[PDB]
Symmetry: C3
Subunit: 137 residues, 3 copies
């Protein structure tokens, strides 16, 4: 009975893993399904949420933070396994305000970063809504 | 004639779908191609464009918006099926201007968000270019 | 000896490529591994780094830029093969400063973009840390 190859039909094993480099055995249909399902990256669609970028390790997070009277903790939807790498954010308003959205990246932790809404000339402002986007791993 | 398994070469079905959990039949080469092609996530490379993050549902969008004399509609390259979740943006300039890039997230729709360029002390400014990045689903 | 199909077990070829649309031959286990490994998108976890969004062509980059006395070059971690499409960024501080994070997108190149930290009323400020996020291809 012939052995299966690229050029000749024959008998073959069917392997049910994604870490075999055997060029001469078939992948199972089940592992095709596992691979397809992996495109549905782990995520949360919450107001403040996250999405894992495949198996790269990178995680994008986002949310709406409400400022307080000091530069205070913005708590990530998902703790970063390693670190926040970068973050950006903007005022959410229906009035023409110029507010400094300032992040203390130098003291960020795996779970939070100090975030504030600065007034021109003055100190931190409370009650400002800030939409932010971050990446880390 | 032996039946194919992980340990014994034999005869097998070849399944041409990505939603079978059959561990004992082969996936077709054709579905390997479908899976490979799925890494080319749906997207637009336009100045204002988007990219779908696999099958997670999340969509990143970006663009260059030109401000008007009021906080006015920034129209997303792709309508969000559900909602915009977060957005950020910056002035594009070659002069040292401080302008408040302000988004009315509270009244965003699936197709647009009111966006303006605020002057310190005064109202909305027209003709300012704003590069933005958003995520939603 | 029966030929493998979706409905009948039989003999089959085993193909070791990801660009065959043959519905009647098996994909190799090895190509299942290649596909799985493709979820680990090419990236750098450096302070200023990047991640490729699968095979879509889109690349997200991020970093921490230090401003100088003029609007000066922010050098991307990875040269864009085509162009930067959008960029955002924020001051990193522990003090309530309002600084204009301004990008000259109109003169960006594949390798850099002129970036500055503007003072209200005055010119560019040196020594300001800016965390940024970009997308392009
Ligand atoms: O730009 S505050
Ligand atoms: Br054949
Ligand atoms: Br197995
Ligand atoms: Br596995
Ligand atoms: Br391996
Ligand atoms: Br290998
Ligand atoms: Br290997
Ligand atoms: Br290996
Ligand atoms: Br994932
Ligand atoms: Br939430
Ligand atoms: Br809220
Ligand atoms: Br408070
Ligand atoms: Br706090
Ligand atoms: Br807290
Ligand atoms: Br967590
Ligand atoms: Br103002
Ligand atoms: Br900092
Ligand atoms: Br730590
Ligand atoms: Br920590
Ligand atoms: Br630590
Ligand atoms: Br206040
Ligand atoms: Br074998
Ligand atoms: Br079929
Ligand atoms: Br299917
Ligand atoms: Br299913
Ligand atoms: Br299942
Ligand atoms: Br299932
Ligand atoms: Br099922
Ligand atoms: Br897609
Ligand atoms: Br466009
Ligand atoms: Br334009
Ligand atoms: Br106008
Ligand atoms: Br409008
Ligand atoms: Br409109
Ligand atoms: Br649309
Ligand atoms: Br100014
Ligand atoms: Br709002
Ligand atoms: Br709605
Ligand atoms: Br709507
Ligand atoms: Br609705
Ligand atoms: Br104006
Ligand atoms: Br069978
Ligand atoms: Br081959
Ligand atoms: Br190939
Ligand atoms: Br092809
Ligand atoms: Br085809
Ligand atoms: Br084809
Ligand atoms: Br083809
Ligand atoms: Br990649
Ligand atoms: Br770096
Ligand atoms: Br630094
Ligand atoms: Br300098
Ligand atoms: Br320079
Ligand atoms: Br340079
Ligand atoms: Br490079
Ligand atoms: Br200030
Ligand atoms: Br510009
Ligand atoms: Br060029
Ligand atoms: Br260039
Ligand atoms: Br060029
Ligand atoms: Br200075
Ligand atoms: Na042969
Ligand atoms: Na074989
Ligand atoms: Na900003
Ligand atoms: Na066996
Ligand atoms: Na079998
Ligand atoms: Na049959
Ligand atoms: Na066949």
């Amino acid at each position: 009975i012939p052995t299966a190859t690229s050029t000749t039909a024959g008998i073959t094993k069917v392997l049910n893993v994604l870490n075999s480099n055997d060029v001469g055995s078939a992948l199972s249909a089940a592992q095709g399904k596992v691979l397809n399902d992996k495109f549905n990256f782990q995520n949360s669609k919450n107001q403040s949420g996250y999405v894992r970028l495949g198996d790269s390790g990178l995680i994008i997070q986002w949310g709406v933070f409400t400022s307080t009277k000091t530069q205070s903790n913005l708590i990530f939807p998902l703790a970063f396994p390693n670190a926040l790498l970068s973050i950006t954010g903007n005022l959410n308003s229906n009035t023409p305000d110029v507010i400094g959205i300032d992040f203390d990246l130098s003291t960020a932790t795996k779970t939070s970063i100090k975030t504030g809404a600065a007034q021109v000339g003055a100190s931190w402002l409370s009650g400002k809504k800030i939409s932010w986007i971050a990446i880390g791993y």
